[PDB]
Amino acid sequence: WIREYPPITSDQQRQLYKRNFDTGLQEYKSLQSELDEINKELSRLDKELDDYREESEEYMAAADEYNRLKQVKGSADYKSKKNHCKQLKSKLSHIKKMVGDYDRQKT
Template identity: 50%
Template sequence: MRSDLMCQQFWLRHFLPVDGTDDISSSVGGLKPRLKDYDTGVESGEDLEDEDFYVLFPSIVDEQERLNYKREFDQEHQEYKSLQAELDSINQDLAELALALNQHPEGGPQFLDAMDQYTRLKNLKKSSGYQIKKKRCKYLRLKLSHIKRKISEYDRRP
């Protein structure tokens, strides 16, 4: 089985914030026009080096190794699903708030309430905690895809 330490080092090397800042900027003025270009925060991000997964999880050579890969997949798949659900929920809430802001008169109580919630969620997405979760989720997706591919390759062998 692959060393957890190696996986941890890979994750730290590729995904922890470099500068350690928690840049939170407010953008209340001119919000309505910008909502037309609203995105859910799914940036392409930097390209990851797949070869690290090839080192950690090379081709499977026997049934025991396949079981180890499957065990690793099952353990981390739950974490991935949980993280992805959390991130999706935040993005869905933001999309709904963006619609609410466009439906209510600017300056009204419903608009201001939606604006407060929208700003809070946008700031949350800029926080280091959210960014770490997002990068961890991306890492897990790539790792799980690689492991699944290796298991499939093993299962298709003659």
């Protein structure tokens, strides 16, 4: 990330990094919310499996949906989005560090 976002040498470059940080943070939060939806549904289904009797149709329905969601979680789409989030998180951490370092020396 340093080749794209090197140490800052001006206030205008700092402002540009801040704008790019905000745009990336929006993307990161949106993708993280999408990934979180599946995990929230899986957590609610785990509780349903604890609740319902094993021989019940309710238990079989919850188990079928749990497996449908695990399949989606293991899909190329979900996993690539997870990887994209890790990349964004890394980039955002780098940009924030560059901005903090520049502000630190302006005092």
